[PDB]
Amino acid sequence: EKTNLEIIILVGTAVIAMFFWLLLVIILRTVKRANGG
Amino acid sequence: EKTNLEIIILVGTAVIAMFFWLLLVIILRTVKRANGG
């Protein structure tokens, strides 16, 4: 159903968003570490 | 309403997801460029 899908999607979108956030931090971390020396 | 929200959220989540994707690529691009020399 439409609703059932709306909820399901949100769950999948929420998890994916959390990952990108964490992954993005780690990436910027290693990159910022090299900039220093 | 619930539905109205479900749709709205999706739109916002879709856009944010597209950004992270592109931004992630650019980041890995500059990082991969340095790895080479």
Structure description:
Chains A, B: Belongs to the protein kinase superfamily. Tyr protein kinase family. CSF-1/PDGF receptor subfamily. Chains A, B: It comes from Homo sapiens. Chains A, B: The chain crosses the membrane at residues 7-27. Chains A, B: This is Vascular endothelial growth factor receptor 2. Chains A, B: It is found in: Cell junction; Endoplasmic reticulum; Cell membrane. The PDB classes it as transferase. The structure is a homodimer of 37-residue chains. Chain A is mainly α and 37 residues long. Chain A has one domain. In chain A, 95% of the residues lie in helices and 0% in strands. Chain A has one helix and no strands. Chain A has one helix at residues 2-36.
Shape call of chain A:
rod-shaped
Q: What is Rg of chain A?
A: 16 Å
Distance between the termini of chain A: 55 Å
Report the helical percentage of chain A. Answer: over 70%
Strand content of chain A: under 5%
Q: How many DSSP-defined strands of chain A?
A: 0
Report the largest inter-chain contact: A-B, 16 and 16 residues
Strand/helix succession of chain A? H
Largest sheet of chain A: none
Q: What class do helices, strands and sheet pairing of chain A give? A: mainly alpha
Integer count of domains of chain A:
1
Quaternary state of the chains = homodimer
Number of helices of chain A: 1
PDB class: transferase
Keywords: vegfr2, receptor tyrosine kinase, transferase
Assembly: dimeric
Entry title: Spatial structure of dimeric VEGFR2 membrane domain in DPC micelles
